[PDB]
A and B are shown apart, each in its own frame.
With several copies, the nearest count.
Chain A
Amino acid sequence: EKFRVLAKKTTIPNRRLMPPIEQFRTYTK
């Protein structure tokens, strides 16, 4: 789901649902 209604006229979206740059420096040094 994405949305759930709490009560009358209250809609809200629900919420109760390899870095390269290091890959280089770790190689060089």
Chain B
Amino acid sequence: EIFYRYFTHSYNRNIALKPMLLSTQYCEYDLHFYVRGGGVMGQSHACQI
């Protein structure tokens, strides 16, 4: 599913892309990550790792 259409509010959304600032490789890559388990906040912080 689409990024804005799954993680609605942005504090769920900046978490997952906080590394992507730290890389400075923005727009170079195409992302596809599949998640299952827990709640939204706990489901996002896994995307950092």
Chain A residues in the interface with B (C-beta under 8 A): 6, 10, 12, 15
Interface pairs (9), CB distance under 8 Å: A6-B27, A6-B28, A10-B27, A12-B26, A12-B27, A12-B28, A15-B24, A15-B25, A15-B28
Chain A nearest CB from B43 CB (Å) reads 29
Where chain B touches its partner, the secondary structure class is loop
Q: Rank and list the top 3 A-B pairs by shortest CB-CB distance, nearest first.
A: A12-B27, A15-B25, A12-B28
Residues on A with C-beta less than 8 A from B27 are 6, 10, 12
Residues on B with C-beta less than 8 A from A6 are 27-28
Residues on A with C-beta less than 8 A from B26 are 12
